[PDB]
Design a protein around this ligand. Structure first.
Ligand SMILES: [K+]
Ligand SMILES: [K+]
Ligand SMILES: [K+]
Ligand SMILES: [K+]
Ligand SMILES: [K+]
Ligand SMILES: [K+]
Ligand SMILES: [K+]
Ligand SMILES: [Mg+2]
Ligand SMILES: [Mg+2]
Ligand SMILES: [Mg+2]
Ligand SMILES: [Mg+2]
Ligand SMILES: [Mg+2]
Ligand SMILES: [Mg+2]
Ligand SMILES: [Mg+2]
Ligand SMILES: [Mg+2]
Ligand SMILES: [Mg+2]
Ligand SMILES: [Mg+2]
Ligand SMILES: [Mg+2]
Ligand SMILES: [Mg+2]
Ligand SMILES: [Mg+2]
Ligand SMILES: [Mg+2]
Ligand SMILES: [Mg+2]
Ligand SMILES: [Mg+2]
Ligand SMILES: [Mg+2]
Ligand SMILES: [Mg+2]
Ligand SMILES: [Mg+2]
Ligand SMILES: [Mg+2]
Ligand SMILES: [Mg+2]
Ligand SMILES: [Mg+2]
Ligand SMILES: [Mg+2]
Ligand SMILES: [Mg+2]
Ligand SMILES: [Mg+2]
Ligand SMILES: [Mg+2]
Ligand SMILES: [Mg+2]
Ligand SMILES: [Mg+2]
Ligand SMILES: [Mg+2]
Ligand SMILES: [Mg+2]
Ligand SMILES: [Mg+2]
Ligand SMILES: [Mg+2]
Ligand SMILES: [Mg+2]
Ligand SMILES: [Mg+2]
Ligand SMILES: [Mg+2]
Ligand SMILES: [Mg+2]
Ligand SMILES: [Mg+2]
Ligand SMILES: [Mg+2]
Ligand SMILES: [Mg+2]
Ligand SMILES: [Mg+2]
Ligand SMILES: [Mg+2]
Ligand SMILES: [Mg+2]
Ligand SMILES: [Mg+2]
Ligand SMILES: [Mg+2]
Ligand SMILES: [Mg+2]
Ligand SMILES: [Mg+2]
Ligand SMILES: [Mg+2]
Ligand code: NA
Ligand code: NA
Ligand code: NA
Ligand code: NA
Ligand code: NA
Ligand code: NA
Lengths: 155, 64, 146, 113
RNA sequence: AUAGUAUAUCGGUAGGGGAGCAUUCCAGCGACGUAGAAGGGAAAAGGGCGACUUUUUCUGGAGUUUCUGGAAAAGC
RNA sequence: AUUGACCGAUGGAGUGAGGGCAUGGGUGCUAAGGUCCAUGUCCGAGAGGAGAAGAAUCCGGACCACCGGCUAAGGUCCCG
RNA sequence: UGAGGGUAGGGGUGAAAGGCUAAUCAAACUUGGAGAUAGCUCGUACUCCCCGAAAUGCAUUUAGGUGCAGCCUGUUGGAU
RNA sequence: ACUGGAAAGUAUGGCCGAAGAGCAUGAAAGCUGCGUAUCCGACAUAUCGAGCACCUGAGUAGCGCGGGACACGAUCCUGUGUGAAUUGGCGGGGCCCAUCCCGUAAGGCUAAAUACUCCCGAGAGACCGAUAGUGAACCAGUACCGUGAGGGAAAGGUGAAAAGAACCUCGAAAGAGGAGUGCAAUAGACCCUGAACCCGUCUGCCUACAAGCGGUAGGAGCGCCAGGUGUGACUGCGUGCCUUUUGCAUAAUGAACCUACGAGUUACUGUUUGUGGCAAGGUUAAUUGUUAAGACAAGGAGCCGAAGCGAAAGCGAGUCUUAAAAGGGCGCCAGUCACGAGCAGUAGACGCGAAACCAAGUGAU
RNA sequence: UAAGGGCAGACGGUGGAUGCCUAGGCUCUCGGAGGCGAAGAAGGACGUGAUAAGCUGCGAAAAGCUGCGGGAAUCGGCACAUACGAAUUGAUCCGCAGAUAUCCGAAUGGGGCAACCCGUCAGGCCCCUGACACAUGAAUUCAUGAGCGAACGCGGGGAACUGAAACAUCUCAUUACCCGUAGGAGAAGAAAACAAAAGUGAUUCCCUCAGUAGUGGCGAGCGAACGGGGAU
């Protein structure tokens, strides 16, 4: 109500008109009036204990290991970006018909550009693993050097 | 914002180990000769706030 | 597994919603009763108010003073000294007490006599109670106030 | 997000207005008039389900009274004779026998008279 | 509600407690649609009970949605 | 003997305009559908039956259904 | 009586009626403080299930408001 | 290839991808168009030693009287009246004095880390979608109202493409019936869909001896399509709803009706509780690093728990009261961080509604 | 039987809800920038087309004029129709630099009821008409300023409703509001400082300290600093 563009003037005198009493033009009861208890800009973040987040990371990885959806592949680096090259690894590993997550230990700019155009393909660094991205893909492809990174970090 | 402590309560009350509230007694200020020594000794002691008033006193002290 | 998430039983609950009809049991007057000050929009409780009778935070007197040179000692009892030493020690000290998380860095320590200190120790604290000091010295220990 | 249940809010009214078909005047189709009339009618139905059992027992007794009187006996004396003889036939059955099978009714009377 | 089917109990204003439905949008696993989506008219059938849901047919001519979880501009 | 009806701690209230009747009273005029207390009760927040039609008089506490049966207060010439 | 000037809101002007000051006057109009305050009146929207009051006492610049007690309800521990 | 008015759809079989973001095209397009990834480009213009006692800020420091600012109803500022010293000096350390400590007034200048958005460029949204969202999607501070300051609307959609209906019939011509275009004209210009209140025509049943909130429970006959559906002769029972009340058919309040709009919300600080993590410990805040806002790792400052009693000095599983004791009072004999929920306070704080108060302007047509 | 009426259904009328859609909003993030004007601004008046109400662009050179770079077949704005033209000797269109730029408005030659009237002075045409100059104030003819415009800064003045369940101290609040005046930021800033025998050394901003020490018709309320952790 305090944000509308109308004047605060009283529209009609309090008594004698024969209709309902009225104040100013910005009332929510009027057509084009104030919006009561509408949205306000909000910050939605909340805190979780650090130990709680570490345990949830281990639970998702345990679920993957139990469902037998973890593949360890030898570390590979391309000479140039080629989307057909990265499709070969996915087709050779038999994980290409469903969402798959590739865990990489380092930058590998060539590999990132080769896998970017493919729909059901996600790349992440082995030290930035979080719970949501693990559970968002059916299959998890770990590089043989990403296992060592994960073992020391999230132990 | 932060809750504010009532300035008069924080000069008249105190907490004990188990959570009770310490208080003084009234009627001990200036008209004293006509009262009895037993009465005055009972009034000189510290006391606790009654159960029915603990809620108000805690609200004044900010649930402390 | 993002398609089948579930929280623990009794962990989440729906919020109360008033003024939305008879079947909810919360419509119409919307839990406010009928009339009076408490039924109006913008009513809030006057915390010290008792209706006009002199309130309790005024009927009672003020008391006491606060000392601007007050000294407080963190109490470290006897039974903790024998427990910590055997677990980890034959010469206890403040820097050792801080290192074991039993006291903050900038805190003063007084040794009290709640327990037994059978193990023979040399002790470096800021203060000692009479009974606590005797307990260490009887048990073949040393007390160093520093 | 902004949530307005236009279709759902309007569907609630349309379902009830099917139930108020056949009423007089504005009571059949004008929403606040019709809903008022429909709600009052439901209160009558709860009361009239109970009164149905009263009205049908009163009608059975009246027919039994006429049938018994054609055989020289009032209702009160005939019922007193049946309950004395242990006959447990209920009033709905007897009234049906009084009206549509008068020869069977006459055999019950001839057993206690 | 108690005991694990038995016993008891079930009129209600202010008011306290429990359990649900619909609405808008989001995540995930998935479906439907010019061989006819949403909306609108008619009819039939369901629900311990209900808020509501489903099916058929006419109109209509392009979008709609199950379940699990999440957030509200969430019902006259 | 008693379906458990009592109490403590702690979260959330509403209420703080009452009313009729019977009994014991004050006041009033041994007036008032008056007024002020006490003890029960009912209406308030209570439908059903009798009283022609009546908030609290008499009978009686409605989970839902039934075109079954027995009774209460009160009735049984007709409307009934 | 015409034209053009002048006096502006606790101010003006008044052969004085609290009259008049743009159909408004015991303090004009417009915008802002501003969603003033209102112990007051009116209004408060889907469903089913369990329980279920009070209209008293004390105090009050109090008496149609409120604080505490009394009476309801959730959870929890005791028997009463 | 099929369906279709029209494939971009669906089913085969190919191909590109550092390009599978998007928008448009007669339906939903990585391969039709504009684009996207990536790479390459400016004639202009714009921007990036000893001694010595000489000096070291005057109507100033300080003071009286009256005010103001400091969290504050010793310190700082001054309207009025006065008024020092000089390094062995001067000022401060919350009246004041002594000692000690800290510092050099009455001259000046200085980037960064901070505040904001008329605007330009690039983006986004568990934000709105035409009574919403800006007052303003169109024409908008417009039309309109006022002497003036000032106040201040309503109003989007044919179709893929105008192919926007040549010509005939009735009419003086308005309007229609045809024809034609088109997937569709009941898409024909106020044109997508096309609800309610309200208004007609037709068909079926009932209705001119009948009297009350208009229904409800029974119940013949008749009309339609195998027991469903429309109607309802006759009978029983029945004084709307809301709000306010001790109590309302009340002749107490309130509404013409419909469609749309319309009223416990969010933030922060507590407290209780359901569910979790860690546990004699629990937890980070600001902020920092890596990667590309998020994510991961750091950040222990601080906060709570861990000992109480006493006004306090202080003693301590004790302490205070006492000259001491006994007695007596208060203590001794699993927390913490979050998530959801109830409640409280501060914010307009469930919504609408005064008479009024104050400030700056506009008015003597 | 039905002058008429009731109910149901079918088909229509009216009206413009709903569904779907978007051309416009709303809240922000990142980067830049933070002015225009006497060499005449912001904002206006009047004009300007083959045709021309209104918008847009433009200014008597008037939907426009000249170069340079780009680009390649259409073009003469929204925006039609008709009419006449332009352009592969490169039109339209885009970027950059120029030319022109009436009247009012700080308005500044004097007046004035804005978009008008009336002059002096020097030149040139012929009762008129061109094209120059001519305000004021603060410095030394010359140089400068004035006015307009988001928020943020710093100064000068400064309420009341409201809370205290009345009200005067107090609160609201060194707020609203009025006025003056900077910059891309501004203000502050290098100890006549804090501290407490232990130490830190300019200013600014964030997290704590802490709703604490205090202050207060000791009512309602108000509310630090030291110390520690950061940015720089
Ligand atoms: K008093
Ligand atoms: K939708
Ligand atoms: K005035
Ligand atoms: K229609
Ligand atoms: K008749
Ligand atoms: K009246
Ligand atoms: K002039
Ligand atoms: Mg106002
Ligand atoms: Mg609006
Ligand atoms: Mg809401
Ligand atoms: Mg004294
Ligand atoms: Mg209730
Ligand atoms: Mg109601
Ligand atoms: Mg009310
Ligand atoms: Mg009341
Ligand atoms: Mg109340
Ligand atoms: Mg209000
Ligand atoms: Mg019962
Ligand atoms: Mg019940
Ligand atoms: Mg709503
Ligand atoms: Mg009272
Ligand atoms: Mg009373
Ligand atoms: Mg009476
Ligand atoms: Mg009496
Ligand atoms: Mg009375
Ligand atoms: Mg009762
Ligand atoms: Mg007079
Ligand atoms: Mg007048
Ligand atoms: Mg006045
Ligand atoms: Mg205010
Ligand atoms: Mg108001
Ligand atoms: Mg009950
Ligand atoms: Mg009152
Ligand atoms: Mg109370
Ligand atoms: Mg001192
Ligand atoms: Mg609008
Ligand atoms: Mg149609
Ligand atoms: Mg249409
Ligand atoms: Mg007759
Ligand atoms: Mg009355
Ligand atoms: Mg009541
Ligand atoms: Mg009545
Ligand atoms: Mg009447
Ligand atoms: Mg009234
Ligand atoms: Mg009326
Ligand atoms: Mg009425
Ligand atoms: Mg109504
Ligand atoms: Mg209405
Ligand atoms: Mg229709
Ligand atoms: Mg619409
Ligand atoms: Mg060229
Ligand atoms: Mg007041
Ligand atoms: Mg400037
Ligand atoms: Mg700076
Ligand atoms: Na209620
Ligand atoms: Na169809
Ligand atoms: Na509605
Ligand atoms: Na003792
Ligand atoms: Na007829
Ligand atoms: Na010229």
């Amino acid at each position: 109500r305090s944000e509308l563009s109308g004047s605060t003037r009283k529209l009609i005198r309090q008594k004698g008109s024969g209709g309902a009493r009225r104040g100013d033009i910005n009332s929510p009861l009027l057509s084009g009036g104030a919006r009561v208890f509408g949205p306000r800009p909000r910050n939605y973040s909340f805190k979780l204990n650090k130990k709680l987040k570490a345990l949830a990371r281990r639970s998702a990885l345990s679920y993957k290991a139990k469902n037998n959806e973890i593949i360890v592949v030898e570390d590979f680096n391309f000479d140039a970006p080629k989307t057909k090259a990265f499709k070969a690894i996915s087709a050779a590993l038999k994980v290409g018909e469903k969402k798959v997550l590739y865990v990489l230990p380092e930058v590998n700019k060539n590999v990132y550009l080769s896998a970017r155009n493919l729909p059901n393909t996600n790349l992440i660094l082995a030290n930035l693993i979080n719970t949501y991205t693990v559970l968002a893909s059916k299959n998890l492809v770990l590089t043989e050097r990403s296992v060592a990174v994960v073992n020391e970090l999230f132990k | 914002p932060k809750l504010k402590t009532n300035s008069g309560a924080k000069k008249r009350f105190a907490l004990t180990g188990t959570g009770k509230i310490k208080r003084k007694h009234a009627f001990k200020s200036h008209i004293l000769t006509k009262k009895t020594k037993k009465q005055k000794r009972n009034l000189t002691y510290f006391s606790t706030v009654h159960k029915v008033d603990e809620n108000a006193v805690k609200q004044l002290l900010c649930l402390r | 597994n993002l398609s089948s998430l579930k929280p623990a039983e009794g962990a989440v609950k729906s919020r109360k919603r008033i003024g939305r009809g008879p079947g909810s049991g919360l419509g119409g007057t919307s839990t406010r009763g009928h009339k009076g000050a408490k039924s109006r929009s913008g009513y809030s409780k006057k915390i010290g108010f008792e209706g006009g009778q002199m309130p309790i935070q005024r009927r009672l007197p003020k008391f006491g003073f606060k000392n601007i040179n007050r000294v407080e000692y963190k109490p470290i009892n006897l039974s903790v000294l024998q427990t910590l030493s055997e677990a980890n020690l034959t010469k206890i000290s403040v820097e050792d007490l801080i290192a074991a998380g039993l006291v903050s860095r900038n805190s003063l320590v007084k040794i009290l006599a709640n327990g037994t200190v059978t193990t023979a120790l040399t002790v470096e604290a800021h203060a000692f109670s009479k009974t606590a000091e005797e307990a260490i010295v009887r048990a073949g220990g040393s007390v160093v106030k520093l | 997000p902004r949530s307005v249940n236009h279709v759902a809010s309007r569907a609630k009214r349309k379902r009830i207005l099917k139930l108020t078909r056949g009423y007089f005047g504005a009571r059949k189709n004008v929403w606040t008039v019709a809903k008022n009339t429909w709600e009052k009618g439901l209160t009558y139905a709860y009361r009239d389900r109970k009164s149905k059992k009263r009205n049908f027992r009163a009608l059975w007794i009246q027919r039994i009274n006429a049938a018994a009187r054609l055989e020289g006996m009032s209702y009160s004396r005939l019922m007193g004779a049946l309950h004395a003889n242990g006959i447990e036939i209920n009033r709905k059955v007897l009234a049906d026998l009084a009206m549509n099978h008068p020869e069977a009714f006459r055999a019950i009377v001839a057993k206690v008279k």
